[PDB]
Amino acid sequence: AVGIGALFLGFLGAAGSTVGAASG
Numbered sequence: 001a002v003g004i005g006a007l008f009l010g011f012l013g014a015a016g017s018t019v020g021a022a023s024g
Contacts, residue, residue: 001009009022016023 013022015021018024
């Protein structure tokens, strides 16, 4: 994870406030 993938894991995963995400 570097560019967009760092947002994907990172920016999006920080917004993983749903069970339907990496934080679930």
